[PDB]
Amino acid sequence: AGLNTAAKAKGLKYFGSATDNPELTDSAYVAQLSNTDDFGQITPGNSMKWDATEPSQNSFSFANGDAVVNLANKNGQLMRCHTLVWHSQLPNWVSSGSWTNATLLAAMKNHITNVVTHYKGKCYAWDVVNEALNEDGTFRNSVFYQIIGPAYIPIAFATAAAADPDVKLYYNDYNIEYSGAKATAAQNIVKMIKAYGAKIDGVGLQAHFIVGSTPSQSDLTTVLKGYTALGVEVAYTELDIRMQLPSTAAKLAQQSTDFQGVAAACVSTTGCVGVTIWDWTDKYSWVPSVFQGYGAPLPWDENYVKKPAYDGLMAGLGA
Ligand SMILES: O[C@@H]1[C@@H](O)[C@H](O[C@@H]2CO[C@@H](O)[C@H](O)[C@H]2O)OC[C@H]1O
Ligand SMILES: O[C@@H]1[C@@H](O)[C@H](O[C@@H]2CO[C@H](O)[C@H](O)[C@H]2O)OC[C@H]1O
Ligand SMILES: *[C@@H]1O[C@H](CO)[C@@H](O)[C@H](O)[C@H]1NC(C)=O
């Protein structure tokens, strides 16, 4: 009947979509987001980030995040919660602080404890740390890495695990979906967390790909298995496949085969629990404002109509 029913038929936990609060006032959008044939899981695109949830130190703000959880709860959808420690979308107080290891650690831990406890029981997974790596596999020079060092990553995991012992704790990153230094470094982050003694349950593969330059099914699968071999689960967390504009029939067909291979890679890897697309309609994609000249990244167009990519995903799911 749809992407999520097809996904569950193959043993995945869900097919899902990100969303954001301004889109929840569009009744046609909400109708399809709420179609559980297609979406069994929701991620908030913005309202669980640090700037949204802790705009001032120890001053938490949950209304916008809770509005997304309320929509998922209405529909019986699972939630992925996104994201606790990330260098982007930080409030001014974090980025402008004069910190010591001890003072920034205390602020970070308090952020994690508060936000994870707030959403205790409500999340399938958290993206505990996002985007910790450079492309060469070195650590990104975020405030957290500059002040705390590598230990910030396992400390974050351990803090989240104390606050909610049942939720799956993920490390989430982009360009870790294909073989290379960054993916190896992400495997090493799993290993480092466990060597510290902290819990990590999953690796989140963003999957922000480009039409005609998408990793192949074989390389996707080799990489997924490289993480599941470590005793963690995997998911594609932010899938979109942006095209160089303008859209054409040929590019739409190529985008279908690109999405097809991602779904098929996940089915072929035991331990791949699901796929989340980063929103579901081109109308609301983040892409065009960030990647100049690119767009039309999703399985529905800006008029809420299925594109050939929808059929590619169904075909990759074996439906
Ligand atoms: O609305 C936008 C969001 O869709 C966007 O989300 C980020 C996209 O890049 C991924 O790497 C991040 O993990 C994800 O949160 O953030 C910017 C915002 O304007
Ligand atoms: O906020 C960041 C973006 O800067 C980032 O961009 C990558 C760069 O390498 C690629 O071409 C990949 O397709 C892009 O998505 O993307 C993720 C986002 O976190
Ligand atoms: C910060 O302190 C923790 C001990 O609380 C430690 O694990 C970490 O390595 C320290 N980092 C730096 C740069 O001192």
Side-chain angles (χ1 to χ4, degrees), residues 18-20 23 44-46 49 82-83 86 88-89 127 130-131 172-174 206 208 237-238 240 278-279 284-287 289-291:
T19 193
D20 197 4
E23 304 160 29
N46 284 304
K49 297 169 174 172
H82 172 84
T83 180
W86 187 30
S88 195
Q89 292 175 267
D127 292 326
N130 201 36
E131 297 184 0
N172 196 54
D173 213 335
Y174 66 91
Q206 294 183 13
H208 297 292
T237 56
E238 315 183 4
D240 54 27
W278 206 243
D279 224 319
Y284 295 128
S285 180
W286 75 305
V287 165
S289 63
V290 171
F291 302 97

PDB file of all heavy atoms in Angstrom, residues 18-20 23 44-46 49 82-83 86 88-89 127 130-131 172-174 206 208 237-238 240 278-279 284-287 289-291, ligand 1:
ATOM      1  N   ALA A  18      11.111  13.472   7.841  1.00  0.00           N
ATOM      2  CA  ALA A  18      11.227  14.699   8.611  1.00  0.00           C
ATOM      3  C   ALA A  18      10.123  15.648   8.293  1.00  0.00           C
ATOM      4  O   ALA A  18       9.467  15.587   7.251  1.00  0.00           O
ATOM      5  CB  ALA A  18      12.603  15.313   8.403  1.00  0.00           C
ATOM      6  N   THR A  19       9.915  16.593   9.191  1.00  0.00           N
ATOM      7  CA  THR A  19       8.942  17.675   8.938  1.00  0.00           C
ATOM      8  C   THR A  19       9.350  18.902   9.702  1.00  0.00           C
ATOM      9  O   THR A  19      10.306  18.848  10.452  1.00  0.00           O
ATOM     10  CB  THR A  19       7.510  17.265   9.260  1.00  0.00           C
ATOM     11  OG1 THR A  19       6.644  18.276   8.698  1.00  0.00           O
ATOM     12  CG2 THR A  19       7.276  17.157  10.744  1.00  0.00           C
ATOM     13  N   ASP A  20       8.660  20.007   9.594  1.00  0.00           N
ATOM     14  CA  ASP A  20       8.987  21.139  10.477  1.00  0.00           C
ATOM     15  C   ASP A  20       7.706  21.856  10.780  1.00  0.00           C
ATOM     16  O   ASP A  20       6.733  21.841  10.002  1.00  0.00           O
ATOM     17  CB  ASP A  20       9.972  22.039   9.808  1.00  0.00           C
ATOM     18  CG  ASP A  20      10.712  23.037  10.836  1.00  0.00           C
ATOM     19  OD1 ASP A  20      10.557  23.046  12.105  1.00  0.00           O
ATOM     20  OD2 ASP A  20      11.294  23.915  10.232  1.00  0.00           O
ATOM     21  N   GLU A  23       5.095  23.770   8.431  1.00  0.00           N
ATOM     22  CA  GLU A  23       4.404  22.895   7.432  1.00  0.00           C
ATOM     23  C   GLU A  23       3.160  22.258   8.027  1.00  0.00           C
ATOM     24  O   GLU A  23       2.268  21.837   7.238  1.00  0.00           O
ATOM     25  CB  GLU A  23       5.399  21.865   6.878  1.00  0.00           C
ATOM     26  CG  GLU A  23       6.622  22.483   6.287  1.00  0.00           C
ATOM     27  CD  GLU A  23       7.786  21.533   6.170  1.00  0.00           C
ATOM     28  OE1 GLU A  23       7.536  20.315   6.012  1.00  0.00           O
ATOM     29  OE2 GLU A  23       8.942  22.015   6.102  1.00  0.00           O
ATOM     30  N   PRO A  44      11.730  15.616  13.790  1.00  0.00           N
ATOM     31  CA  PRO A  44      11.627  17.094  13.704  1.00  0.00           C
ATOM     32  C   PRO A  44      12.843  17.675  12.964  1.00  0.00           C
ATOM     33  O   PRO A  44      13.977  17.436  13.427  1.00  0.00           O
ATOM     34  CB  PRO A  44      11.583  17.512  15.178  1.00  0.00           C
ATOM     35  CG  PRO A  44      12.337  16.393  15.899  1.00  0.00           C
ATOM     36  CD  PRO A  44      12.171  15.121  15.108  1.00  0.00           C
ATOM     37  N   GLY A  45      12.614  18.446  11.962  1.00  0.00           N
ATOM     38  CA  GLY A  45      13.744  19.018  11.205  1.00  0.00           C
ATOM     39  C   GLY A  45      14.531  20.057  11.917  1.00  0.00           C
ATOM     40  O   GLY A  45      15.714  20.248  11.608  1.00  0.00           O
ATOM     41  N   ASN A  46      13.945  20.752  12.857  1.00  0.00           N
ATOM     42  CA  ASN A  46      14.572  21.857  13.539  1.00  0.00           C
ATOM     43  C   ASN A  46      14.252  22.026  15.027  1.00  0.00           C
ATOM     44  O   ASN A  46      15.053  22.546  15.764  1.00  0.00           O
ATOM     45  CB  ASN A  46      14.242  23.177  12.841  1.00  0.00           C
ATOM     46  CG  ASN A  46      15.005  23.378  11.588  1.00  0.00           C
ATOM     47  OD1 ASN A  46      16.213  23.346  11.520  1.00  0.00           O
ATOM     48  ND2 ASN A  46      14.241  23.558  10.506  1.00  0.00           N
ATOM     49  N   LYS A  49      16.645  20.892  18.032  1.00  0.00           N
ATOM     50  CA  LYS A  49      18.020  21.363  18.063  1.00  0.00           C
ATOM     51  C   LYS A  49      18.313  22.233  19.192  1.00  0.00           C
ATOM     52  O   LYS A  49      17.388  22.733  19.868  1.00  0.00           O
ATOM     53  CB  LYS A  49      18.361  21.973  16.704  1.00  0.00           C
ATOM     54  CG  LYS A  49      18.295  20.981  15.599  1.00  0.00           C
ATOM     55  CD  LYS A  49      18.386  21.723  14.236  1.00  0.00           C
ATOM     56  CE  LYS A  49      18.473  20.643  13.115  1.00  0.00           C
ATOM     57  NZ  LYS A  49      18.377  21.238  11.726  1.00  0.00           N
ATOM     58  N   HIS A  82      16.197  14.559  17.161  1.00  0.00           N
ATOM     59  CA  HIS A  82      17.350  15.076  16.412  1.00  0.00           C
ATOM     60  C   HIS A  82      17.527  16.505  16.820  1.00  0.00           C
ATOM     61  O   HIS A  82      16.544  17.270  16.644  1.00  0.00           O
ATOM     62  CB  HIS A  82      17.007  14.984  14.879  1.00  0.00           C
ATOM     63  CG  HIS A  82      17.972  15.623  13.973  1.00  0.00           C
ATOM     64  ND1 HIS A  82      19.110  14.963  13.555  1.00  0.00           N
ATOM     65  CD2 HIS A  82      17.996  16.834  13.409  1.00  0.00           C
ATOM     66  CE1 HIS A  82      19.783  15.758  12.725  1.00  0.00           C
ATOM     67  NE2 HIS A  82      19.119  16.885  12.615  1.00  0.00           N
ATOM     68  N   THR A  83      18.676  17.002  17.322  1.00  0.00           N
ATOM     69  CA  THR A  83      19.915  16.319  17.624  1.00  0.00           C
ATOM     70  C   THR A  83      20.478  17.019  18.830  1.00  0.00           C
ATOM     71  O   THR A  83      20.230  18.190  19.011  1.00  0.00           O
ATOM     72  CB  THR A  83      20.907  16.304  16.402  1.00  0.00           C
ATOM     73  OG1 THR A  83      22.077  15.634  16.752  1.00  0.00           O
ATOM     74  CG2 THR A  83      21.208  17.704  15.860  1.00  0.00           C
ATOM     75  N   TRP A  86      25.794  19.269  18.340  1.00  0.00           N
ATOM     76  CA  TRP A  86      26.079  19.599  16.937  1.00  0.00           C
ATOM     77  C   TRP A  86      26.627  21.014  16.949  1.00  0.00           C
ATOM     78  O   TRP A  86      26.305  21.876  17.778  1.00  0.00           O
ATOM     79  CB  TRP A  86      24.770  19.562  16.139  1.00  0.00           C
ATOM     80  CG  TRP A  86      24.904  19.719  14.644  1.00  0.00           C
ATOM     81  CD1 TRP A  86      25.924  19.350  13.841  1.00  0.00           C
ATOM     82  CD2 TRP A  86      23.911  20.281  13.790  1.00  0.00           C
ATOM     83  NE1 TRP A  86      25.606  19.613  12.548  1.00  0.00           N
ATOM     84  CE2 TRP A  86      24.382  20.187  12.485  1.00  0.00           C
ATOM     85  CE3 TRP A  86      22.650  20.916  13.981  1.00  0.00           C
ATOM     86  CZ2 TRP A  86      23.662  20.628  11.388  1.00  0.00           C
ATOM     87  CZ3 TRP A  86      21.973  21.360  12.867  1.00  0.00           C
ATOM     88  CH2 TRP A  86      22.461  21.183  11.610  1.00  0.00           C
ATOM     89  N   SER A  88      26.267  23.237  14.539  1.00  0.00           N
ATOM     90  CA  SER A  88      25.401  24.159  13.850  1.00  0.00           C
ATOM     91  C   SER A  88      24.112  24.434  14.643  1.00  0.00           C
ATOM     92  O   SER A  88      23.717  23.612  15.460  1.00  0.00           O
ATOM     93  CB  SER A  88      25.033  23.627  12.459  1.00  0.00           C
ATOM     94  OG  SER A  88      24.473  24.664  11.645  1.00  0.00           O
ATOM     95  N   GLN A  89      23.452  25.566  14.428  1.00  0.00           N
ATOM     96  CA  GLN A  89      22.194  25.836  15.126  1.00  0.00           C
ATOM     97  C   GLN A  89      22.377  25.799  16.635  1.00  0.00           C
ATOM     98  O   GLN A  89      21.513  25.376  17.362  1.00  0.00           O
ATOM     99  CB  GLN A  89      21.021  25.013  14.581  1.00  0.00           C
ATOM    100  CG  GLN A  89      20.660  25.472  13.160  1.00  0.00           C
ATOM    101  CD  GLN A  89      19.595  24.644  12.505  1.00  0.00           C
ATOM    102  OE1 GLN A  89      19.867  23.715  11.808  1.00  0.00           O
ATOM    103  NE2 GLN A  89      18.348  24.985  12.745  1.00  0.00           N
ATOM    104  N   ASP A 127      19.681  11.136  17.774  1.00  0.00           N
ATOM    105  CA  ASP A 127      21.007  11.495  17.164  1.00  0.00           C
ATOM    106  C   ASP A 127      21.733  12.290  18.238  1.00  0.00           C
ATOM    107  O   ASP A 127      21.447  13.434  18.487  1.00  0.00           O
ATOM    108  CB  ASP A 127      20.765  12.325  15.915  1.00  0.00           C
ATOM    109  CG  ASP A 127      20.150  11.558  14.820  1.00  0.00           C
ATOM    110  OD1 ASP A 127      20.447  10.358  14.702  1.00  0.00           O
ATOM    111  OD2 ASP A 127      19.422  12.209  13.964  1.00  0.00           O
ATOM    112  N   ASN A 130      26.009  14.783  16.174  1.00  0.00           N
ATOM    113  CA  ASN A 130      25.858  14.986  14.738  1.00  0.00           C
ATOM    114  C   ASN A 130      27.116  15.568  14.178  1.00  0.00           C
ATOM    115  O   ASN A 130      27.596  16.586  14.678  1.00  0.00           O
ATOM    116  CB  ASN A 130      24.659  15.916  14.501  1.00  0.00           C
ATOM    117  CG  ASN A 130      24.061  15.842  13.149  1.00  0.00           C
ATOM    118  OD1 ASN A 130      23.994  14.765  12.527  1.00  0.00           O
ATOM    119  ND2 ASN A 130      23.516  16.921  12.656  1.00  0.00           N
ATOM    120  N   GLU A 131      27.629  15.026  13.088  1.00  0.00           N
ATOM    121  CA  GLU A 131      28.618  15.695  12.228  1.00  0.00           C
ATOM    122  C   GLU A 131      29.924  16.004  12.949  1.00  0.00           C
ATOM    123  O   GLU A 131      30.399  17.155  12.888  1.00  0.00           O
ATOM    124  CB  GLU A 131      28.010  16.900  11.552  1.00  0.00           C
ATOM    125  CG  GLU A 131      26.878  16.567  10.636  1.00  0.00           C
ATOM    126  CD  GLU A 131      26.342  17.744   9.893  1.00  0.00           C
ATOM    127  OE1 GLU A 131      26.779  18.892  10.015  1.00  0.00           O
ATOM    128  OE2 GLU A 131      25.342  17.483   9.172  1.00  0.00           O
ATOM    129  N   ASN A 172      25.331  10.304  14.112  1.00  0.00           N
ATOM    130  CA  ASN A 172      24.721  10.696  12.775  1.00  0.00           C
ATOM    131  C   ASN A 172      25.709  11.566  12.016  1.00  0.00           C
ATOM    132  O   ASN A 172      26.339  12.467  12.585  1.00  0.00           O
ATOM    133  CB  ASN A 172      23.407  11.459  13.025  1.00  0.00           C
ATOM    134  CG  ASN A 172      22.520  11.591  11.836  1.00  0.00           C
ATOM    135  OD1 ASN A 172      22.179  10.548  11.186  1.00  0.00           O
ATOM    136  ND2 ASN A 172      22.182  12.801  11.514  1.00  0.00           N
ATOM    137  N   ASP A 173      25.894  11.276  10.722  1.00  0.00           N
ATOM    138  CA  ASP A 173      26.833  12.064   9.929  1.00  0.00           C
ATOM    139  C   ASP A 173      26.491  11.859   8.461  1.00  0.00           C
ATOM    140  O   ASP A 173      25.763  10.939   8.059  1.00  0.00           O
ATOM    141  CB  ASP A 173      28.276  11.727  10.222  1.00  0.00           C
ATOM    142  CG  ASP A 173      29.213  12.892  10.104  1.00  0.00           C
ATOM    143  OD1 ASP A 173      28.950  13.852   9.384  1.00  0.00           O
ATOM    144  OD2 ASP A 173      30.331  12.783  10.736  1.00  0.00           O
ATOM    145  N   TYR A 174      27.040  12.768   7.633  1.00  0.00           N
ATOM    146  CA  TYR A 174      26.965  12.675   6.163  1.00  0.00           C
ATOM    147  C   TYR A 174      28.312  12.329   5.603  1.00  0.00           C
ATOM    148  O   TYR A 174      29.355  12.431   6.224  1.00  0.00           O
ATOM    149  CB  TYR A 174      26.505  14.036   5.585  1.00  0.00           C
ATOM    150  CG  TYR A 174      27.472  15.138   5.772  1.00  0.00           C
ATOM    151  CD1 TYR A 174      28.439  15.375   4.763  1.00  0.00           C
ATOM    152  CD2 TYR A 174      27.464  15.975   6.905  1.00  0.00           C
ATOM    153  CE1 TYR A 174      29.320  16.438   4.963  1.00  0.00           C
ATOM    154  CE2 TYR A 174      28.311  16.984   7.054  1.00  0.00           C
ATOM    155  CZ  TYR A 174      29.278  17.188   6.072  1.00  0.00           C
ATOM    156  OH  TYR A 174      30.103  18.317   6.298  1.00  0.00           O
ATOM    157  N   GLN A 206      23.199  10.071   6.950  1.00  0.00           N
ATOM    158  CA  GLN A 206      22.295  11.085   6.459  1.00  0.00           C
ATOM    159  C   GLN A 206      21.781  10.832   5.063  1.00  0.00           C
ATOM    160  O   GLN A 206      20.610  11.061   4.773  1.00  0.00           O
ATOM    161  CB  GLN A 206      22.885  12.431   6.621  1.00  0.00           C
ATOM    162  CG  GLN A 206      23.109  12.919   8.062  1.00  0.00           C
ATOM    163  CD  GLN A 206      23.651  14.308   8.151  1.00  0.00           C
ATOM    164  OE1 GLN A 206      23.676  15.093   7.150  1.00  0.00           O
ATOM    165  NE2 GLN A 206      24.083  14.688   9.330  1.00  0.00           N
ATOM    166  N   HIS A 208      22.459  12.519   2.136  1.00  0.00           N
ATOM    167  CA  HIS A 208      22.250  13.646   1.253  1.00  0.00           C
ATOM    168  C   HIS A 208      23.036  13.471  -0.020  1.00  0.00           C
ATOM    169  O   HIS A 208      24.253  13.782  -0.062  1.00  0.00           O
ATOM    170  CB  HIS A 208      22.607  14.958   1.931  1.00  0.00           C
ATOM    171  CG  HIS A 208      21.751  15.259   3.131  1.00  0.00           C
ATOM    172  ND1 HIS A 208      20.417  15.558   3.037  1.00  0.00           N
ATOM    173  CD2 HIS A 208      22.058  15.323   4.440  1.00  0.00           C
ATOM    174  CE1 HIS A 208      19.916  15.742   4.248  1.00  0.00           C
ATOM    175  NE2 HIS A 208      20.905  15.570   5.119  1.00  0.00           N
ATOM    176  N   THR A 237      19.005   8.315   7.611  1.00  0.00           N
ATOM    177  CA  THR A 237      18.301   9.261   8.508  1.00  0.00           C
ATOM    178  C   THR A 237      17.796  10.543   7.845  1.00  0.00           C
ATOM    179  O   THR A 237      16.870  11.190   8.364  1.00  0.00           O
ATOM    180  CB  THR A 237      19.165   9.625   9.673  1.00  0.00           C
ATOM    181  OG1 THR A 237      20.427  10.161   9.175  1.00  0.00           O
ATOM    182  CG2 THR A 237      19.412   8.420  10.538  1.00  0.00           C
ATOM    183  N   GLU A 238      18.387  10.946   6.728  1.00  0.00           N
ATOM    184  CA  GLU A 238      18.030  12.262   6.134  1.00  0.00           C
ATOM    185  C   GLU A 238      18.026  12.180   4.588  1.00  0.00           C
ATOM    186  O   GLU A 238      18.515  13.111   3.904  1.00  0.00           O
ATOM    187  CB  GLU A 238      18.931  13.389   6.613  1.00  0.00           C
ATOM    188  CG  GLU A 238      19.221  13.421   8.095  1.00  0.00           C
ATOM    189  CD  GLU A 238      20.042  14.567   8.540  1.00  0.00           C
ATOM    190  OE1 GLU A 238      20.405  15.479   7.776  1.00  0.00           O
ATOM    191  OE2 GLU A 238      20.304  14.508   9.842  1.00  0.00           O
ATOM    192  N   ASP A 240      17.849  12.363   0.786  1.00  0.00           N
ATOM    193  CA  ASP A 240      17.364  13.186  -0.308  1.00  0.00           C
ATOM    194  C   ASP A 240      18.385  13.086  -1.430  1.00  0.00           C
ATOM    195  O   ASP A 240      19.541  12.756  -1.140  1.00  0.00           O
ATOM    196  CB  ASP A 240      16.985  14.622   0.089  1.00  0.00           C
ATOM    197  CG  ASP A 240      18.032  15.392   0.780  1.00  0.00           C
ATOM    198  OD1 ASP A 240      19.266  15.166   0.608  1.00  0.00           O
ATOM    199  OD2 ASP A 240      17.665  16.373   1.550  1.00  0.00           O
ATOM    200  N   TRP A 278      14.330  13.393   4.090  1.00  0.00           N
ATOM    201  CA  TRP A 278      14.421  14.717   4.744  1.00  0.00           C
ATOM    202  C   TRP A 278      13.402  15.621   4.195  1.00  0.00           C
ATOM    203  O   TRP A 278      13.585  16.478   3.346  1.00  0.00           O
ATOM    204  CB  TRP A 278      15.886  15.284   4.657  1.00  0.00           C
ATOM    205  CG  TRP A 278      16.161  16.223   5.752  1.00  0.00           C
ATOM    206  CD1 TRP A 278      16.459  17.554   5.627  1.00  0.00           C
ATOM    207  CD2 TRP A 278      16.194  15.903   7.174  1.00  0.00           C
ATOM    208  NE1 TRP A 278      16.611  18.128   6.890  1.00  0.00           N
ATOM    209  CE2 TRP A 278      16.457  17.139   7.863  1.00  0.00           C
ATOM    210  CE3 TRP A 278      15.946  14.772   7.913  1.00  0.00           C
ATOM    211  CZ2 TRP A 278      16.558  17.189   9.287  1.00  0.00           C
ATOM    212  CZ3 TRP A 278      16.087  14.821   9.306  1.00  0.00           C
ATOM    213  CH2 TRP A 278      16.384  16.024   9.948  1.00  0.00           C
ATOM    214  N   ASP A 279      12.186  15.407   4.775  1.00  0.00           N
ATOM    215  CA  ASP A 279      10.913  15.880   4.213  1.00  0.00           C
ATOM    216  C   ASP A 279      10.578  15.057   3.024  1.00  0.00           C
ATOM    217  O   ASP A 279      11.369  14.204   2.614  1.00  0.00           O
ATOM    218  CB  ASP A 279      10.810  17.437   4.108  1.00  0.00           C
ATOM    219  CG  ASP A 279       9.428  17.986   4.593  1.00  0.00           C
ATOM    220  OD1 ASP A 279       8.443  17.370   4.279  1.00  0.00           O
ATOM    221  OD2 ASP A 279       9.534  18.978   5.298  1.00  0.00           O
ATOM    222  N   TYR A 284       9.234  21.867   0.285  1.00  0.00           N
ATOM    223  CA  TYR A 284       9.754  22.162   1.603  1.00  0.00           C
ATOM    224  C   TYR A 284      11.189  21.700   1.817  1.00  0.00           C
ATOM    225  O   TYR A 284      11.726  21.837   2.924  1.00  0.00           O
ATOM    226  CB  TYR A 284       8.874  21.633   2.715  1.00  0.00           C
ATOM    227  CG  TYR A 284       7.509  22.317   2.745  1.00  0.00           C
ATOM    228  CD1 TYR A 284       6.371  21.600   2.746  1.00  0.00           C
ATOM    229  CD2 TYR A 284       7.461  23.688   2.899  1.00  0.00           C
ATOM    230  CE1 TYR A 284       5.098  22.195   2.830  1.00  0.00           C
ATOM    231  CE2 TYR A 284       6.186  24.353   2.877  1.00  0.00           C
ATOM    232  CZ  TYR A 284       5.053  23.526   2.885  1.00  0.00           C
ATOM    233  OH  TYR A 284       3.754  24.087   2.983  1.00  0.00           O
ATOM    234  N   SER A 285      11.845  21.254   0.755  1.00  0.00           N
ATOM    235  CA  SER A 285      13.240  20.815   0.888  1.00  0.00           C
ATOM    236  C   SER A 285      14.157  21.932   1.309  1.00  0.00           C
ATOM    237  O   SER A 285      14.102  23.020   0.744  1.00  0.00           O
ATOM    238  CB  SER A 285      13.733  20.187  -0.375  1.00  0.00           C
ATOM    239  OG  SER A 285      15.071  19.766  -0.235  1.00  0.00           O
ATOM    240  N   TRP A 286      15.107  21.599   2.235  1.00  0.00           N
ATOM    241  CA  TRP A 286      16.169  22.493   2.512  1.00  0.00           C
ATOM    242  C   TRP A 286      17.155  22.787   1.415  1.00  0.00           C
ATOM    243  O   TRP A 286      17.998  23.660   1.546  1.00  0.00           O
ATOM    244  CB  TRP A 286      16.946  21.960   3.734  1.00  0.00           C
ATOM    245  CG  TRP A 286      17.827  20.785   3.447  1.00  0.00           C
ATOM    246  CD1 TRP A 286      17.509  19.572   2.887  1.00  0.00           C
ATOM    247  CD2 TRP A 286      19.261  20.710   3.669  1.00  0.00           C
ATOM    248  NE1 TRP A 286      18.607  18.762   2.749  1.00  0.00           N
ATOM    249  CE2 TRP A 286      19.694  19.432   3.245  1.00  0.00           C
ATOM    250  CE3 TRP A 286      20.194  21.606   4.179  1.00  0.00           C
ATOM    251  CZ2 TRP A 286      21.033  19.083   3.315  1.00  0.00           C
ATOM    252  CZ3 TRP A 286      21.499  21.223   4.307  1.00  0.00           C
ATOM    253  CH2 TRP A 286      21.908  19.989   3.862  1.00  0.00           C
ATOM    254  N   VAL A 287      17.194  21.918   0.410  1.00  0.00           N
ATOM    255  CA  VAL A 287      18.274  21.970  -0.561  1.00  0.00           C
ATOM    256  C   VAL A 287      18.468  23.311  -1.320  1.00  0.00           C
ATOM    257  O   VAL A 287      19.648  23.707  -1.379  1.00  0.00           O
ATOM    258  CB  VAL A 287      18.122  20.761  -1.514  1.00  0.00           C
ATOM    259  CG1 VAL A 287      18.988  20.943  -2.783  1.00  0.00           C
ATOM    260  CG2 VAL A 287      18.504  19.467  -0.770  1.00  0.00           C
ATOM    261  N   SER A 289      18.091  26.357  -0.955  1.00  0.00           N
ATOM    262  CA  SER A 289      18.710  27.524  -0.295  1.00  0.00           C
ATOM    263  C   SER A 289      20.155  27.335   0.116  1.00  0.00           C
ATOM    264  O   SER A 289      20.831  28.333   0.419  1.00  0.00           O
ATOM    265  CB  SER A 289      17.865  27.965   0.868  1.00  0.00           C
ATOM    266  OG  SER A 289      17.813  26.966   1.825  1.00  0.00           O
ATOM    267  N   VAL A 290      20.655  26.105   0.151  1.00  0.00           N
ATOM    268  CA  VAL A 290      21.995  25.754   0.576  1.00  0.00           C
ATOM    269  C   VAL A 290      22.883  25.417  -0.618  1.00  0.00           C
ATOM    270  O   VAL A 290      24.123  25.692  -0.628  1.00  0.00           O
ATOM    271  CB  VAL A 290      21.985  24.581   1.606  1.00  0.00           C
ATOM    272  CG1 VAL A 290      23.346  24.013   1.949  1.00  0.00           C
ATOM    273  CG2 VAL A 290      21.294  25.105   2.843  1.00  0.00           C
ATOM    274  N   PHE A 291      22.328  24.686  -1.628  1.00  0.00           N
ATOM    275  CA  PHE A 291      23.122  24.153  -2.731  1.00  0.00           C
ATOM    276  C   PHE A 291      22.644  24.886  -3.979  1.00  0.00           C
ATOM    277  O   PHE A 291      21.686  24.470  -4.654  1.00  0.00           O
ATOM    278  CB  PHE A 291      22.947  22.619  -2.846  1.00  0.00           C
ATOM    279  CG  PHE A 291      23.329  21.851  -1.601  1.00  0.00           C
ATOM    280  CD1 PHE A 291      22.362  21.483  -0.731  1.00  0.00           C
ATOM    281  CD2 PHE A 291      24.639  21.488  -1.374  1.00  0.00           C
ATOM    282  CE1 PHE A 291      22.746  20.727   0.385  1.00  0.00           C
ATOM    283  CE2 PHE A 291      25.025  20.792  -0.233  1.00  0.00           C
ATOM    284  CZ  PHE A 291      24.041  20.389   0.606  1.00  0.00           C
TER     285      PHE A 291
HETATM  286  O1  LIG B   1      15.345  23.657   7.704  1.00  0.00           O
HETATM  287  C1  LIG B   1      16.726  23.329   7.691  1.00  0.00           C
HETATM  288  C2  LIG B   1      16.863  21.868   8.088  1.00  0.00           C
HETATM  289  O2  LIG B   1      16.189  20.997   7.143  1.00  0.00           O
HETATM  290  C3  LIG B   1      18.348  21.515   8.088  1.00  0.00           C
HETATM  291  O3  LIG B   1      18.562  20.181   8.600  1.00  0.00           O
HETATM  292  C4  LIG B   1      19.918  19.767   8.582  1.00  0.00           C
HETATM  293  C5  LIG B   1      20.221  19.381   7.146  1.00  0.00           C
HETATM  294  O4  LIG B   1      21.577  18.956   7.190  1.00  0.00           O
HETATM  295  C6  LIG B   1      21.793  17.772   7.982  1.00  0.00           C
HETATM  296  O5  LIG B   1      23.087  17.579   7.913  1.00  0.00           O
HETATM  297  C7  LIG B   1      21.430  18.094   9.464  1.00  0.00           C
HETATM  298  O6  LIG B   1      21.750  16.921  10.272  1.00  0.00           O
HETATM  299  C8  LIG B   1      20.018  18.555   9.415  1.00  0.00           C
HETATM  300  O7  LIG B   1      19.574  18.913  10.759  1.00  0.00           O
HETATM  301  O8  LIG B   1      19.049  22.351   8.989  1.00  0.00           O
HETATM  302  C9  LIG B   1      19.061  23.684   8.544  1.00  0.00           C
HETATM  303  C10 LIG B   1      17.618  24.196   8.516  1.00  0.00           C
HETATM  304  O9  LIG B   1      17.468  25.525   7.946  1.00  0.00           O
END
